[PDB]
Swiss-Prot record, chain A:
Cytoplasmic-side positions: 257-272, 322-336
Keyword Glycosyltransferase: no
GO CC, one annotated term: plasma membrane
Regions annotated as coiled coil: none
Subcellular location: Cell membrane
Portion of the full sequence shown: 584 to 1266 of 1732
Molecular functions (GO terms): calcium channel activity; calmodulin binding; G-protein beta/gamma-subunit complex binding; monoatomic cation channel activity; phosphatidylinositol-4,5-bisphosphate binding; temperature-gated ion channel activity; zinc ion transmembrane transporter activity
Subunit description: Homotetramer. Interacts with TRPM1; the interaction results in the formation of a heteromultimeric cation channel complex that are functionally different from the homomeric channels.
Non-spanning membrane segments, not crossing the bilayer: 382-398
Source organism: Mus musculus (Mouse)
Family: Belongs to the transient receptor (TC 1.A.4) family. LTrpC subfamily. TRPM3 sub-subfamily.
Encoding gene per record: Trpm3
Extracellular-side positions: 227-233, 294-297, 365-381, 399-407
UniProt name for this protein: Transient receptor potential cation channel subfamily M member 3
Length: 544, 205
């Protein structure tokens, strides 16, 4: 049980380590689900055939498949991290992939047979598996083909909508309801109290958060675009309050992380790039604010810090756009193409620096050491490749001042530089982007579909009010959206449905295999050989 | 697809424009001209109108504004993001969706020829500038075709022959496929093996 808890993850708990089993153990029977124990034993001993036999006997096939996938993945990681023979690691990875494929195929069969029971099967609480659900087990194993399935996506959509039945045109009606509280009563609800069920759906919280962020960005633009007084204005106070409330919310969401160690939660949180960028931006804003309430030079420096800081808050709108079905994958593609762009920026820089150094050295041969020399190398050669070409400045004529020695070479090297930069490298980068688009697009779609789950969970676990108004909610401090509690009779119904689905899956697989061309050809050849031998023996006899 | 990228381009452009305007002009009364300086020049820049002496004026010269050296750096980053990354990504998007769009457009145009022909069949002879008179003044072919009994029977017989030939050709194609031949051969081989086993089972000697 301890090893199972170690391998499964953070908050998992095994039945062997609970009080009931310990009390039974330390005063000495039976297992209501023996095949659960048998399959766990087979997986832990790396016996794949035995585990596959045990999987298709008993109840809860999909939960067992997901647990086996997670356990094999963890065991492979542990073997790889202890410097073992490294073939055990690939064997364990193959086992994990086999179990994941089994889970995906079972989900597909269940969804095809009956959609409502398929959705019910992915959410009911698993008493035998640490009170988890199939969706949680799939997310913990990072099974992307499972979450990106149609049934999982529709379940995520239903959890996103909450207790609201509208599906044809959302967003506009949510915004209208937030802006017009009396307009809430005109909406239809699933099976007064409509206000509570409206202001607690994740989509309503998301739209409230988005509107608050838009207003905050508007106020930030206003304060940077107008002249500052000695002390902050009302809009500046609102901006500071929003920044502070967002900072304390980010701080307190670190203390609700799964690990029990304060220093462990910090490094777990510092794994999303948006969190690191948010922390850096908040620190920079704090520095600029504490430097703004001083004498004029420090005030100017703080204002410049504000001006630089507003760019990040502008760029952060892409994170909000990532909720759209089309904009999110595009942002992921941009992030993936930045690396290919950076691999060409270096070559372009080499060529640009060569040209700039040559031009500066030739045209200005009597220069004292100065820092302006480092600027003239990069400035104009960089502006030239974006259309700002001026022949009278790249090579000035020479009433006119005497001609510098070798001044005629500057136009020639300029022509070569323009040809290399604007024709060769640009077109090569275009070809690189063109020929890698398909796989990047597919991967981005899959990753966005997988990451919808964390967005839905995050907005389910958040307060009703947005950051500028959660100042009070900090002092004041799952029937659905996470789980689904089922009764005994409905549990039996779900078990029977799952057993029928797995039986149909195996029968269909056998029928497909037996009717393939290769199997028919093989069987025909064997039967023909045996028949030929039998006929030869029959003709061998001489009864005449 | 172009509109889905215009939004990202607008976000980047507005960030750069607000930063530049705020840094370079620190003493401004609220005015509607501020809303114009954010979009105007940053938009013209990405179409070739780049002027380094105006994006970052030198500073005999007026005193240097605090942080005036950051404008060329953010300008370089903005140009690199706009003219290299997003443009090439949009080119790739157009390139990789061209085939299906072209095929669908061809099919839709071929379908929509019919309504054009009907519309110009149902229209007056005179063109709009002088159809006024027609307004006051107010199908053997082009829509239908009226046929006689003998020709109707001919058309019926032709259709019956065509459907019979269609079914016969479909059956002939199905029966001569490799899969059907393999299946029939396997079944016959199995039955023949069972029959030969039964024949060899007897012992008349
Ligand atoms: C102050 C200067 C502003 C610097 C802000 C750039 C940092 C944003 C990166 C955010 C991130 O890392 O998320 C990763 C994010 C996801 O990682 P994950 O959430 O941890 O899985 O990857 C992305 O999809 C973001 C890709 C879009 C960012 C490209 C736009 C950068 C333009 C900057 C130049 C603007 C021109 C200047 C005017
Ligand atoms: C010449 O005399 C004019 C005077 C009126 C002066 O009022 C000014 C007050 C600030 C205000 C309303 C004005 C110009 C810039 C305006 C900004 C542009 C910003 O752009 C947006 C751009 C896009 C948004 C995402 C961010 O903000 C605005 C929220 C922002 C914006 C509309 C805030 C409002 C600003 C007009 C006459 O009075 C009778
Ligand atoms: C106005 O008064 C200023 C004066 C300071 C004078 O010192 C100068 C001495 C040469 C030095 C340090 C300076 C400017 C160009 C500098 C070059 C730029 C080159 O770029 C790099 C570019 C990229 C590299 C690959 C190649 O070299 C440098 C190795 C190169 C580089 C840093 C060599 C160093 C040069 C400053 C005051 O003194 C107290
Ligand atoms: Na140009
Ligand atoms: Na150009």
């Amino acid at each position: 049980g301890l090893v199972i808890e170690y391998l499964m993850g953070g908050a998992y708990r095994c039945n062997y380590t609970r009080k009931r089993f310990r009390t039974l153990y330390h005063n000495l029977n039976h297992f209501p689900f023996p095949f659960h124990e048998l399959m766990v034993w087979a997986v832990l001993m790396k016996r794949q055939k035995m585990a596959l036999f045990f999987w298709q006997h008993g109840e809860e096939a999909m939960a067992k498949a997901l647990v086996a996938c997670k356990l094999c993945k963890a065991m492979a990681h542990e073997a790889s991290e202890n410097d073992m023979v490294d073939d055990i690691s690939q064997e364990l990875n193959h086992n994990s992939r086999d179990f994941g494929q089994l889970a995906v195929e079972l989900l597909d069969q269940s969804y095809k047979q009956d959609e409502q029971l398929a959705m019910k099967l992915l959410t009911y609480e698993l008493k035998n598996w640490s009170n988890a659900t199939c969706l949680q087990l799939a997310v913990a194993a990072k099974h992307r083909d499972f979450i990106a399935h149609t049934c999982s996506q529709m379940l995520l959509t239903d959890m996103w909508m909450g207790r609201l039945r509208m599906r044809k045109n959302s967003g506009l009606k949510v915004i209208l309801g937030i802006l017009l509280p009396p307009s809430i009563l005109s909406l239809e609800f699933k099976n007064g109290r409509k206000i509570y069920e409206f202001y607690n759906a994740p989509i309503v919280k998301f739209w409230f958060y988005t509107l608050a962020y838009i207003g905050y960005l508007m106020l930030f633009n206003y304060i940077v675009l107008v002249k500052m007084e000695r002390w902050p204005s009302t809009q500046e106070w609102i901006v500071i309050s929003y920044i502070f409330t967002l900072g304390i919310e980010k701080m307190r969401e670190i203390l609700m992380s799964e690990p029990g160690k304060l220093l462990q939660k910090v490094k777990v949180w510092l794994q999303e790039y948006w969190n690191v960028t948010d922390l850096i931006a908040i620190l920079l804003f704090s520095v600029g604010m504490i430097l703004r309430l001083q004498d004029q030079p420090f005030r100017s420096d703080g204002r410049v810090i504000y001006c630089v800081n507003i760019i990040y808050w502008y760029i952060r709108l892409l994170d909000i756009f990532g909720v759209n079905k089309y904009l999110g994958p595009y942002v992921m593609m941009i992030g993936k193409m930045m690396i290919d762009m950076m691999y060409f920026v270096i070559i372009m820089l080499v060529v640009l620096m060569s040209f700039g150094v040559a031009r500066q050295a030739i045209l200005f041969p009597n220069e004292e050491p100065s820092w302006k020399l480092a600027k003239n190398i990069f400035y104009m050669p960089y502006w030239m490749i974006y259309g700002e070409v001026f022949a009278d400045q790249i090579d000035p004529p020479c009433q006119l001042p005497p001609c510098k020695t070798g001044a005629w070479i500057v136009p020639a090297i300029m022509a070569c530089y323009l040809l290399v930069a604007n024709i060769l490298l640009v077109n090569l980068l275009i070809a690189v982007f063109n020929n890698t688009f398909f796989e990047v697009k597919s991967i981005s779609n899959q990753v966005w579909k997988f990451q919808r789950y964390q967005l839905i969970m995050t907005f389910h676990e958040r307060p009703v009010l947005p950051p500028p108004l959660i100042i009070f909610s900090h002092m004041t401090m799952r029937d659905y959206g996470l789980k689904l509690f089922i009764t005994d009779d409905e549990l039996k119904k779900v078990h029977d449905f799952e057993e029928q689905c797995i039986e149909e899956y195996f029968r269909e697989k056998d029928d497909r295999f037996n009717s393939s061309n290769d199997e028919r050809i093989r069987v025909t050849s064997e039967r023909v050989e045996n028949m030929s031998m039998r006929l030869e023996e029959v003709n061998e006899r001489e009864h005449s």
